[PDB]
Amino acid sequence: SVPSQKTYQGSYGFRLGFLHSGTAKSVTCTYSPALNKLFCQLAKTCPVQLWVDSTPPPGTRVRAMAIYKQSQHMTEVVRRCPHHERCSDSDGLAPPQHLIRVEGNLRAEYLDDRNTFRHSVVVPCEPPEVGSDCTTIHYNYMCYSSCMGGMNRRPILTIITLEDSSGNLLGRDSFEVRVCACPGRDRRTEEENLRK
Ligand SMILES: CN1CCC(Nc2cccc3c2cc(C#CCNc2ccc(C(C)(C)C#N)nc2)n3CC(F)(F)F)CC1
Ligand SMILES: [Cl-]
Ligand SMILES: [Zn+2]
Secondary structure, three states, X not given: OOOOOOOEOOOOOOEEEOOXXXXXXXXXXXXXXXXXXXXXXXXXXXXXXXXXXXXXXOOOEEEEEEEEOOHHHOOOOOOXXXXXXXXXXXXXXXXXXXXXXXXXXXXXXXXXXXXXXXXXXXXXXXXXXXXXXXXXXXXXXXXOOOOOOOOOOOOEEEEEEEEOOOOOEEEEEEEEEEEOOOHHHHHHHHHHHHHO
16 A cells, blocks of 8 residues: 555645755755755755644654655565665664664654555654754665665655554655765756756
8 A cells, every 4th residue: 555645734734845955966965846855865855844834742753754756666566676685784773674764863763564564764843942843753764766676767756744642544655765975966956857
């Protein structure tokens, strides 16, 4: 079964935000608003901002899940490739098959859905730190988009869901992801492509 990707702000006005990191050759993560697409390097920090108009209840959580963007691939579970699932690089929380990890949160939980076999990672959410206006989650993507036998050059979306403590939907947003060696050049190219 395919989870919904429909944007849904919900009662709390939930939506994502991204830093403005530019497209320099050295950038490790960069987001294209024009493409709604995040470009990032393998296993590097990807900051994703969480925004709401009003604070949801304590016990609200935020889940990330990858799905293939193309129609003929969306029912296939997005997972790490045969090489990376075997490279013994788990931090002790993330199963080695999971593409998306959360960096720097010991309360991250990883789900293998018993019915759909899809992977997700979920963390508690908290109000912003003093002097900040949003919360930030640090994600890591653990395969390249080009990894053969995994994503296999197929585009993916990350679906971010705001959930109550039972897992019921409160909000949903999403963005395309390319995991690549030079995010800055690839963002410029695809943006110049779109422009042409
Ligand atoms: C004008 N107002 C606009 C919205 C601003 N608040 C936010 C702005 C941006 C992000 C925000 C928030 C709030 C949350 C959150 C949560 C859920 N947990 C949680 C835990 C503990 C507690 C307390 C009360 C301390 C306890 N006990 N209350 C909630 N988040 C994260 C989320 F939901 F977006 F992921 C505040 C000002
Ligand atoms: Cl930018
Ligand atoms: Zn891989």
